[PDB]
């Protein structure tokens, strides 16, 4: 099953010799900031393009409705 | 509050009408400007809708305050 | 076009809007009485039965007495003929007309639609219904209405065939509530909102239980996921590569 | 990759392309599809 | 040892219990299990609803109402089916967008991408003919508008239209044949899903790093069963909220009116998951050109594993252009729900042109430039 | 740090045929408690609006 | 085209150096190199170039990929002392791969195929 | 090879083109391919039928009549779907009798036999609930008589019965759920057929000689394609005769009367392929004992690979006893269409006793005696 040549030492601890969810509270703000640091540019360019084009379209639609008035 | 057999909604709607004097002025301007029409297509439904949307948004929570 | 769209209805503070809130069952009872005395002269509500009003709106005996005051066609008998009888709990609400064509003929060509699902069948349902019932205003400049039609800016197009039907004191409630036009409109709108979603209270109770159970189970499953993945997330690999 | 990477790597040459005789004999299957459709629908006044 | 004695134990053990999987898979690799679970949910609730639905134009709406009110647990089943269709489309669309972001269709996984595009086309047809079954106003008029696109084909357009209808208009034979086709096509979806999953197990999954992962593989059953359970519970929360608190949020109020072939609604719109195709169709003022543009969109989707270069995080120009593509498809979704207007026609035309530009110009050429930048 | 007791392990946890009936009785009581809490909160919030409130009011 | 294509190459070189700077900053936190981003399953020439290599180079490449995948699972980066030593642009594969691709281009002009196929499993 | 580069072509080649098959198989090894062809034909005809059938009382009979007289090619489709069930059962019964004659379920093909017995049970349920669908007198009264046999299980009787009916008698809910269950069950039949064929391919087929045939194997796709085509053409001839010349020969005339719950027909008998089980049930003067005997027949069928010793020729005593078993089963098939009479009750009891005697006493003990005679 796909022999891989490799030289290493691997260590593993029992899952009943460590904690489960206690470190999740410590790392939660750091992980939040790291997520937004990594995906900040893409989410921002998505938001700018989508909301800008939607806002321009809705504004010009409102102007079109106003132009039909008497 | 005391509930009345008469309808409180026209009185509340008349009370909110000073809060939307600008839209009323726009509607009356439209109604004056299409006075001499002859084609039968000129109407002022949009400015009317603006005025009544303002009045409705004012009077909506005050109508259900008077109803059981 | 704005006139074809009609005037939008404002958002009214209904007491059943929140996911934690039930219906006002006293208002459903008063709303049904507006239905029997004003609505039902020209509206059918063909998917309601008297059995469904029990435990929501009336007791069994009250609903039986209400159903027994209606004439229901039944048959055929042993002689192959059609007869009439007293209504019962399993019977549906009486329709004022036998067919759509006589309903159109009695109303200038317009067919008054069924009201069982009119609340969920319109955009902004209860607010539109209340504003339509209490909103027979004066037409704006340049808008003329033909004979047999009445102005209502909440109706799309502005020219409805339903006249003003709610009047002050036109219903005598049995709980002492004074019956203005707005109170009648609010009660019948509550009854129609119940008719579109008859199990909203039970659905919300089940949804509260389901959301609580799934929210606890999410934490328990996250615990069992992190327990299984712990020997991998904390493993130590040492190799000769530095790069 | 095999589609456009092969064109960009210079692996698609005239000596590796199929011949004009191969393109003639492969493209002769187009008449088979036409006559199969005419056999299936029979939408003709061709029999006279 | 015990699974070595029976074939069915051996196949299940190999492909579910001891299947090697990259250890660094994140939660973007849960869309497939969620899509399979939503297909199973749709099949179960549909089989249960079929015991009370009647496929006749005189009894369809009435049987829907009777199932809603009188059948025990019938409202839960009906709302679960109608909103599970939307959640099925959400999960599948996010799965496809994951594949577009990471370039997962590339070699040696062209078969997986092609069977995926086949699955998505079958899914679209299944949902469209299922929506006609309640026989409301939207159910009638959308089937009328969409099946009238066959007359854009010259000479033999009206003949194919009348053959699909069973008459001169959408009526009872259309509803009966749509019910049979709608019962049938989910089983083809289950078969296609089995083939699609068995195609992926030939080589394995890709990882978020985009590198070869054969040095770091762990068993599927012990580790990714719990990780899939977590995402299934997050999906069950959203499913519960949609079924019990906002059941008609993703629907249309006009489908609660019975169908009338002599009075059309003012705004005929589909479900939300067909709105981008509808915007592509409405933006072009020619029916044949609109149908051709939709077909070219799906042809570009088929041709992705052979024209697409550019993958995940380390290929940064295409990674930045992915978000522009995502904004474009959501703008197409929003534009479909709005009425025809010169500015919406212009914006829809520009958005369709940008979708074609991204699919056919950015993915080959910018991918080739970044391969030359990184390894030239 | 915190650790399950040995004597409580040998009784309810070592065999699956003892673990499963304990699981079912715990499931029953958990469902009863969740039902009680949800119903009490709903009836307290919507007091005076239900049908049973009107019926008990008419007594 | 030749009048403007004389100086279109330094602009290409500047964009390539900026691209490699950004991506190599991204790669160095995982301990990777630019040549580790090439998959033998994705390309049969890379699969051919990888079997032309001495065994210690392949062992080092596998070790780097294993370390990066472990780091990706742990949501970590390399520590500062390891991160300052990373050399993302030290090539071990580009000469062999360039020779393989030149051989394949040479065989194709004479109508011959490559003497290898894709990696086929099962 | 071209089939070595796409995994779909490799599986299809391995299991349909180059699969090694014994070269001395006679024409009694064509039962399985004929059964698969009949399953595919039933699925196709039914999916076509469901586009004109309405699964409601007061519309079902009229929809079948509209299908028969107004749908183009509708009479052919209905008669083909009705007689195809009979031909499907003829072929599957001859397949089972072949396996009984040759001892085909023995080691190592016990999974093949067990999956076959499961397929047969699903076929029986599918055919019964599909026979209810036209809503005639025979449909209604057979569904009444069979489903009101759950009142033999103590305590939990009529509860299960009323839950099956959706009411207090066979009515519109029973028909409406029977339509959904009948549409759904043939896809389970197709999946079980695929699993059944895949279980045989682990060890390959037996031969008429009953010896090891690993030395003399030939390719399936060339030699056994035309051999299956010949038998398929014979089956098509019989099928065409049944559809076009004697379409109502195998049926019952009472099923052309609309169902009346207040008037019962004089003789209530099922279709011919259910008659042997009906005779076993009707012969025993106790409902619970009849259901126990019906269950015991299928339990003894499941236990056949683990108790049955003895194959085809060169085992001559069990070979001769097979013909008595075949006569017994055909006698039970004849007795089910008669009236209840003391002589017919006695003969049916004797036939049921001999059926159990052969299945549980002759096959182990006479087979062991044959092994002790031949190799002792
Ligand atoms: C609230 C504000 C909303 C906005 C912020 C969102 C959360 C903030 C942090 C974000 C984040 O990185 O999430 C992972 C974050 C930490 O991640 P990490 O340790 O860096 O890496 C682990 C992986 O990221 C995660 O991988 P994993 O599989 O190892 O962890 C699974 C599990 C981690 O397991 C947990 O610890 C979660 C526990 C669930 C609570 C349920 C409680 C009810 C029942 C209790 C039963 C528990 C039994 C245990 C009892 C024994 C205890 C001794 O995480 C979850 O599935 C929970 C939700 C996490 C985010 C999902 C939403 C993202 C989009 C934002 C939408 C909001 C708008 O975990 C949490 O959010 C849980 C802690 C709670 C945060 C509150 C503030 C703390 C200060
Ligand atoms: C949703 C489908 C995914 C569920 C994954 C199954 C599982 O491991 O049980 C978790 C979970 C059991 O809860 P748990 O107590 O946290 O897990 C048991 C121990 O943590 C650890 O139990 P274990 O390590 O002995 O679990 C091995 C698992 C055998 O796991 C496998 O081989 C998984 C094969 C299918 C993977 C499905 C991925 C989608 O067999 C079982 O004990 C459960 C068999 C039911 C499948 O499954 C459930 O019963 C939850 C509802 C799912 C239906
Ligand atoms: C006349 C009708 C009146 C209608 C009024 C209601 C219209 C819609 C509500 C108002 C919407 C405007 C603010 C929306 C804020 C949403 C959040 C957001 O953008 O954050 C995403 C995003 C968040 O990034 P993340 O936190 O990294 O995900 O924020 C940004 O990146 C900033 C986005 C700024 C770009 C949009 C600016 C507004 C466009 C208006 C264009 C007008 C053109 C005029 C041309 C004609 C002149 C004559
Ligand atoms: C998107 C994928 C999808 C799948 C898969 C699917 N359905 Fe549905 N189905 C729908 C939609 C959409 C509707 C329309 C729901 C609505 O608006 O009321 C629907 C409605 C129905 C209805 C009409 C009842 C009603 O509530 O309108 C039946 C019957 C039905 N489906 C049966 C099935 C069956 C049987 C299966 C599977 C074996 C199945 N469906 C699978 C999408 C799907
Ligand atoms: C005089 C007979 C009549 C009475 C009584 C009547 N209606 Fe109307 N109703 C109509 C007609 C006619 C229409 C349709 C008008 C049209 O579509 O132009 C209609 C329409 C409606 C509509 C739908 C409007 C829409 O936009 O589709 C509602 C809701 C409604 N009625 C509710 C009520 C209520 C509540 C009452 C009792 C206060 C009532 N009806 C009493 C004749 C009546
Ligand atoms: C148009 C594309 C597409 C569609 C639609 C699609 N798939 Fe996927 N799917 C893929 C690709 C590509 C992969 C391989 C991605 C990888 O491993 O990196 C994949 C992987 C998977 C996986 C493995 C893990 C994962 O989530 O990536 C599963 C399971 C899966 N698909 C199931 C389904 C099911 C079930 C459906 C629909 C009913 C479906 N897929 C629809 C393209 C698709
Ligand atoms: C109760 C038993 C039984 C039933 C019912 C049954 N099978 Fe068979 N089938 C067998 C056995 C045993 C064999 C192996 C015969 C041998 O190799 O001697 C077999 C062999 C086959 C074969 C290989 C060719 C042949 O005929 O020997 C096919 C194909 C097949 N079965 C298909 C089917 C299909 C399709 C169905 C039903 C729709 C079906 N079988 C029903 C027991 C059964
Ligand atoms: C094993 C047998 C069998 C299979 C497989 C089968 N059916 Fe039939 N089905 C029957 C029988 C028998 C009838 C009764 C026909 C009659 O007497 O008119 C029937 C009746 C029907 C009817 C009622 C219309 C009519 O003419 O009776 C429909 C619809 C139908 N089947 C659909 C299907 C569909 C759909 C499938 C598969 C996807 C299917 N059937 C597969 C046995 C079967
Ligand atoms: C690493 O990658 C992988 C994943 O990702 C993390 C996975 O998740 C899975 C597991 C796959 C799942 C859960 C998807 C479900 C699979 C399919 C094929 C969906 C279609 C199947 C259906 C709808 C079954 C329903 C039909 C039935 C039961 C037949 C009808 C019969 C009866 C009702 C009796 C695998 C193997 C995997 O390798
Ligand atoms: C309210 O309503 C509406 C819908 O619905 C919910 C819609 O979706 C759409 C628009 C949807 C689009 C453009 C995407 C989906 C498009 C198509 C063409 C769906 C495919 C269905 C077809 C062609 C119907 C024919 C059915 C067949 C062939 C059955 C399948 C069987 C076999 C192939 C053997 C609109 C406008 C609509 O207003
Ligand atoms: C005249 O009268 C008669 C009939 O009538 C025409 C008959 O046919 C039969 C033949 C029927 C027999 C022998 C029994 C059939 C077998 C079973 C298990 C009964 C059917 C069970 C049902 C309908 C329970 C509901 C289950 C359904 C619909 C499907 C279950 C789903 C799955 C397994 C996935 C006899 C004897 C009969 O004398
Ligand atoms: C002892 O030696 C053997 C035999 O004896 C000589 C056999 O007979 C067979 C099996 C024979 C097979 C598989 C062919 C018979 C056909 C079957 C089972 C299916 C019938 C299907 C037909 C006619 C066409 C179906 C068409 C379609 C389009 C359905 C597919 C659907 C989709 C693609 C969506 C085997 C394995 C064998 O070892």
TrEMBL record, chain A:
Provenance organism: Chlamydomonas reinhardtii
Name by which UniProt lists this protein: Mitochondrial ubiquinol-cytochrome c oxidoreductase subunit 8
Name of one Pfam family that matches: Cyt_b-c1_8
Keywords linked to the UniProt accession: Electron transport, Membrane, Mitochondrion, Mitochondrion inner membrane, Oxidoreductase, Respiratory chain, Transmembrane, Transmembrane helix, Transport
MF annotations from Gene Ontology: oxidoreductase activity
Cellular localization per UniProt: Mitochondrion inner membrane
GO cellular component: mitochondrial inner membrane; respiratory chain complex III
Family stated for the protein in its record: Belongs to the UQCRQ/QCR8 family.
Record keyword Transmembrane present: yes
Organism superkingdom: Eukaryota
Chief place of localization: mitochondrion
Primary enzyme class: oxidoreductase
Bilayer topology annotation: Single-pass membrane protein
GO biological processes: mitochondrial electron transport, ubiquinol to cytochrome c
EC number: 1.10.2.2
Automatic annotation (TrEMBL), chain B:
SUPFAM superfamilies: Non-heme 11 kDa protein of cytochrome bc1 complex (Ubiquinol-cytochrome c reductase)
GO molecular function annotations of the record: oxidoreductase activity
Recorded topology in the membrane: Peripheral membrane protein
Highest taxon in the source lineage: Eukaryota
One GO process term, biological-process aspect: mitochondrial electron transport, ubiquinol to cytochrome c
Described purpose of this protein according to its UniProt entry: Component of the ubiquinol-cytochrome c oxidoreductase, a multisubunit transmembrane complex that is part of the mitochondrial electron transport chain which drives oxidative phosphorylation.
Family: Belongs to the UQCRH/QCR6 family.
Protein name per the record: Cytochrome b-c1 complex subunit 6
Organism the protein comes from: Chlamydomonas reinhardtii
Lineage: Eukaryota, Viridiplantae, Chlorophyta, core chlorophytes, Chlorophyceae
UniProtKB/TrEMBL annotation, chain D:
EC number: 1.10.2.2
GO molecular function: oxidoreductase activity
Organism: Chlamydomonas reinhardtii (Chlamydomonas smithii)
Top-rank taxon: Eukaryota
Enzyme class (EC, first level): oxidoreductase
Full-protein positions shown: 2 to 49 of 59
Protein name: Mitochondrial ubiquinol-cytochrome c oxidoreductase subunit 10
Keywords noted in UniProt: Oxidoreductase
From TrEMBL, chain G:
Membrane-related topology note: Peripheral membrane protein
Main localization of the protein described in the UniProt heading: mitochondrion
GO BP annotations listed: mitochondrial electron transport, ubiquinol to cytochrome c
One cellular-component annotation, GO: respiratory chain complex III
Coiled coil: none
InterPro entries: QCR7, QCR7_sf
Location in the cell: Mitochondrion inner membrane
Keyword Electron transport recorded: yes
Keyword vocabulary terms for this entry: Electron transport, Membrane, Mitochondrion, Mitochondrion inner membrane, Respiratory chain, Transport
Protein family per UniProt: Belongs to the UQCRB/QCR7 family.
PANTHER family (UniProt xref): CYTOCHROME B-C1 COMPLEX SUBUNIT 7, UBIQUINOL-CYTOCHROME C REDUCTASE COMPLEX 14 KD PROTEIN
Role summary: Component of the ubiquinol-cytochrome c oxidoreductase, a multisubunit transmembrane complex that is part of the mitochondrial electron transport chain which drives oxidative phosphorylation.
Protein name: Cytochrome b-c1 complex subunit 7
Organism: Chlamydomonas reinhardtii
Taxonomy of the source species: Eukaryota, Viridiplantae, Chlorophyta, core chlorophytes, Chlorophyceae
